[PDB]
Amino acid sequence: ALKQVAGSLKLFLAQYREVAASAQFGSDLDASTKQTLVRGERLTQLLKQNQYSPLATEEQVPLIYAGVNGHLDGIELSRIGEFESSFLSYLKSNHNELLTEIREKGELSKELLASLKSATESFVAT
Amino acid sequence: GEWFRDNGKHALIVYDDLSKQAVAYRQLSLLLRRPPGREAYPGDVFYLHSRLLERAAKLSEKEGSGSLTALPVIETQGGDVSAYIPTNVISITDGQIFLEAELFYKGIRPAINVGLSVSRVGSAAQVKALKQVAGSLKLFLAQYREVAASAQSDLDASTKQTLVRGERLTQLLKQNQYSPLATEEQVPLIYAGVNGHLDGIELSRIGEFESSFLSYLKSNHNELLTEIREKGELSKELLASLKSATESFVAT
Amino acid sequence: GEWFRDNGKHALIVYDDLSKQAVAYRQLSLLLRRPPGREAYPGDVFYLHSRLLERAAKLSEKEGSGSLTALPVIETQGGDVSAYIPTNVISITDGQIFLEAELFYKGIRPAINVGLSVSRVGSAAQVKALKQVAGSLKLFLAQYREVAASAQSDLDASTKQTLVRGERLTQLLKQNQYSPLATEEQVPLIYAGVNGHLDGIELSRIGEFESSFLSYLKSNHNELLTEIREKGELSKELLASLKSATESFVAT
Amino acid sequence: KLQFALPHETLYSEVTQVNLPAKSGRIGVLANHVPTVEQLLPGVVEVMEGSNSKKFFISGGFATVQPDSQLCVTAIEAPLESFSENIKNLLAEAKKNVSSSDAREAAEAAIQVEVLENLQSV
Amino acid sequence: ATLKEVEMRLKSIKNIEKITKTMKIVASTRLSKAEKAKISAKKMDEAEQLFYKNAETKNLKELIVAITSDKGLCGSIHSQLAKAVRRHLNDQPNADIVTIGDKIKMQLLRTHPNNIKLSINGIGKDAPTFQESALIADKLLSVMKAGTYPKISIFYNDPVSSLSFEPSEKPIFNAKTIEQSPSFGKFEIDTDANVPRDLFEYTLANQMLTAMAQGYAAEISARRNAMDNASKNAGDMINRYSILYNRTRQAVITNELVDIITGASS
Amino acid sequence: ISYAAYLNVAAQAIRSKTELQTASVLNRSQTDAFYTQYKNASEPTPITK
Amino acid sequence: LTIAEYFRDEEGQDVLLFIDNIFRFTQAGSEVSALLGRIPSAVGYQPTLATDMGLLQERITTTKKGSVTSVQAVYVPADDLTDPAPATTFAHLDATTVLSRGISELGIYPAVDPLDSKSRLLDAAVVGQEHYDVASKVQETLQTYKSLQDIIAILGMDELSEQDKLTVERARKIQRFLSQPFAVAEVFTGIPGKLVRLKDTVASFKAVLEGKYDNIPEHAFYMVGGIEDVVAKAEKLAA
Amino acid sequence: LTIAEYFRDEEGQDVLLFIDNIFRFTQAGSEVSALLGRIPSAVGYQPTLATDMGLLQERITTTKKGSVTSVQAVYVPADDLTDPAPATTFAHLDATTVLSRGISELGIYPAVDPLDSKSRL
Amino acid sequence: LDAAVVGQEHYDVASKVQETLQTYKSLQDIIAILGMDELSEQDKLTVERARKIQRFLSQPFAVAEVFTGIPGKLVRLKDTVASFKAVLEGKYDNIPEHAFYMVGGIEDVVAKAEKLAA
């Protein structure tokens, strides 16, 4: 499940720093580059984690899922931390059947994807 | 040197230089087949200096009040005070007078880099007169260095003043070789600098100003120099009288 | 090699290479437990190579005029000529032909770094003709690699020129492997460049120019080539002849 | 005095007569001319200081007779007899062909036609 | 603390140095070519704005055009000009804004996102030309309807010397504002074909070319100046790192030797 | 088209003999400037003016 | 190697000798050298490092009896190619594929350093003048780009010559075109491996150098086969 | 040097001694020291670097009888002036004459650099 | 340095201070070569602020009175936490750098800023 949602996260994050390098000499970027610069800056933010606060894959997956796809781009940067815990609580009360599924079946099908895609898109409007 | 110390008298000892002592010691240790450490010096190259320099001291009343004062000389390479031997000695002595090669080439001699120079115990032992006209000179000067380094982004108002005073005290601090000067010959020059009576005078003439100013003081206001010499302090009256004679000379 | 030298003849010796020979001698010395020094070399590794290399020599007329000429090879690591063995050999010898990957990858082959190569002997060993046309080559290329970082819009006609010239003179110095040129083939090529006959020729065509130009001189001007070869100098008549035959071809 | 000024080249910055092509009419600036402002359409321009007569070619711009009584000319491009058959009618057969059809750009290459006619005027 | 680090940290700066030192000469070649465009521009404007001086023309919503360029490395050209627009634009938080050159944008975009309705691009390469000045004017009339404004203002840097400059403001008057003037009658302008219409449109183009030419030569002087201070400042670090290099290199030879030595003793 | 821009077309017909067409003539007859209308933040296509 | 030699001499046939990792031979002898009584040589290695290596390497060879094609993985201590061990290994090889950290980090696999890798066979007499010219130009193009990268971090792109912009733009394509999914590598690529025939490679890169694909997006050269594959990938991204 | 001393001590002259090149004196002692089994010092120079240098230099001086004055050619390894060889040498140098191609390539003979060349005197 | 010991507010301040200082560090080379002008506004402000923190972290010890010329000040933890918290909150941006140098808490900055402005 984690493998799927973390597509080219590692290569992408490289493409991000390839660009966070070009941003240095006071550049101005085209639509693709300014966006991926925004995406990665938030992806980085989502990788922050407290000590003694480890997470289960079924909690990890939705976070990485929301991140890479861009359901976090139009959110103010300093609030990704409170997003992480609000959202995991939201999915525990509303769309809990989903998280239950990931823990047990360790995999995703179109049905799990679109449910979660529909579920995350929901939360974004707080 | 110690004989003087132990017999109620005072001795100054210059070690010129310890860098070369250390090198000789290294020669002996390697031929003695002692293991080379950092920069090939033996482990005891610190103890070499430390035991030597610990012998400098000021003694108690009971021990006759003698003193041995040490001025060890160290030679940096490429101006690096962080090398092994420099830092060893700095961790022994009570301060450093650092001399910059950069200042030296510019003609600023003595080339004392004030930022990097310090005396850890001497402030106590300073002659009051100097201490009084050295008000913050320590802080100010080595801080005019803040502006000076930045200077060459704005043609400022406030920080254009400190650039003109700074430059002056920098010349006042210059000094010809073989010409050590008495305290009472010193304090006026500094008073005249610190209170900005030089601000109007050009750089190229601060040299001539100083010789001509001391002549003036000797012939005309010798009573006052004598008072500086004999009491070592500046009474409000002598302070005010000194202001008087300063303004007069500058005007002409 | 020395049999040739001692008997009125001339031998060339290539030692490919001395890096590897110094490694071999180090093996022997370490295993014989002689004392090691820098990079673990024995204190007589300089003596090994100088002993070896001073044997190349140009003998007096009394002694038969024989000669031995040496091309020792040294491999550096990361271009570090301050390494122990390159140091030894650089200083023993009479000059350096310095090769570089950078140049190599740019297509400049042989990848000789002009500004780092030298022959202390110099002119004394050059055919006079080549010395005549090359005089300035030394110069333009020198002035080229100084203004290089400019090769990246707004530059006066002075610099645009300097850049045009050098590009082409650089290109002229490229050469295929296994294709050494006769002196009489070299000088007219160098002459054309040195004197500006290549300026108007797009940079990619300097190669085919060289080839064509040579063959053209061979069919039409075998006289100029024969003189260059047979006389070793260029008279003002040869120079003038060369000038004409060049423009003739460049136009055509 | 006269001041002639192109943005890339200042030409003329005491005079007796100057000749401009104004709104429609071709004014010959008299010595004491009442201050007047008139646009310059494409055409030739002459200056005088003795019996010195010499023309240029004007793209367009403004001419202002000033309260100092001096003249001021400004065009964008300017000689014509000394800056010139082979040069002229070159992309003039490419002028009508890119006239052209329809977008709205037709208007910019319609500004080429009327201009070339009154450029090969003399 | 290792040779590799110090040697390559040196190789970053040695190029930074050589490069900043090149664009000071490329800046100096560009210097005269642009002192020339500034002279030709002023001279043209001097003939045009002299009429406005005589007509004693003043100003009875707003458009602000601020001019610099795309490229940095020119000191505080973009900054204290942006700041001049901040000082003036306090009186008018509703003045529409067109910016010329991306750097004045990122300055004015972060301070007032909404006022910027238009932004121009790829400007400070070569000297400004009339085409640029014109087509920018054209679009100020097109989508920005420059005609339909009470007051117009151009912002640009005037070059005073080769060491300092001053962010300046100069006004633009429209068809209407030219007519209703203290001294329109001084001139015998023909009141027939739309003249004030043109003298405004022609001036919009011109007074910008003249603002850009001055802003450019201010920029070019500021580059050659900032780069001189940089190449100087770089060399200083190169000097300080050539010294550290040398220490480390010596240390490397010694430390390597001590291992050989310990190894040999046993 | 406008009085400034109109003049320019008659300044590029005037501009376009190859021999007197010196280097700083071809420069003046070109431009790499893109206009972008900026709403709210940004807006539409950047077009080569 | 003893096994390998036997096939070469008494099977009279083309043997293939794969060694991963030959560095470990020099390391091993190194680990016992002090306890064998030796004074150490430089960088900690044995005094016999080179002659040790000749004895091994000079056996790994084609003789007149039979042919051996050997491929040896060679670790490079701390990426330092000048460390005595790999540095003594170079001169035993007819072809040296040099892998690079700076390339791997750019997401380019195999991370083969296109400039630093060499072959005895890159020679017109062998590969043909065309092949040789293509390789030569590819290399000049990349070097020019490697050169210019110093500018492209301080001045950006904009101060670049027309000719040079074209080069740099072509270079970044060529650089990516040199990547390939491996069949053995699918696990780290999620991309079905590709094999590309030599004649295609030459044709493909030749074509790129002439500029017959400057109109095509960058990402379309990355991690694909030959020029067919690149034209396919461009259409998919266009949809 | 011994030959030079005889002209001073017995003939009373002011004598020139040229040493080309002083660095090769150092390196030789570095090499002898290594053959003698002596543990090397910093940068691989002999532990006796300074005294080896002193034993040569201190003999070049002015007596009451004359002087031996010495012009010594100085190589700088790695162009690093803090290298123990130049560093030790410099300790004994009273002046430098700096010959520059940059002075030569302006056709100035001798090619002495007036800004570079420095003297204690 | 852990929220479960010092409280989240303390932690958060310490860390943002640390992020701020770190930004200046990553920049030093560029500040020294190319000056302040070649920073983005974000950066310029962070650099401007970091230097105020830098200096605010300095403190006159009582035992170095001879070298400071100034009496030894001492700051209660709770005051350090709050004082720094406020600087980050952009509450003291208009203040010149010099007013944070060699003082105690934030009350002392206010004081020295007015001392300079007279």
Side-chain angles (χ1 to χ4, degrees), chain B residues 127-129 132 227-235 238:
Chain B
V127 174
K128 272 203 159 176
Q132 295 182 324
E227 211 217 88
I228 298 166
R229 187 196 314 124
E230 283 191 307
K231 288 203 186 66
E233 299 180 357
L234 300 181
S235 49
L238 189 77

Side-chain angles (χ1 to χ4, degrees), chain E residues 9 16 72-76 107 110 230 233-234 237, chain I residues 28-29 32-34 37-42 44-45:
Chain E
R9 179 174 181 81
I16 291 189
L73 302 176
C74 52
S76 27
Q107 270 284 56
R110 195 218 49 156
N233 264 342
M237 277 203 181
Chain I
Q28 311 291 352
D29 272 356
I33 302 300
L34 305 178
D37 295 323
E38 304 308 308
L39 301 174
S40 69
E41 282 301 350
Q42 267 202 47
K44 201 171 296 181
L45 180 61

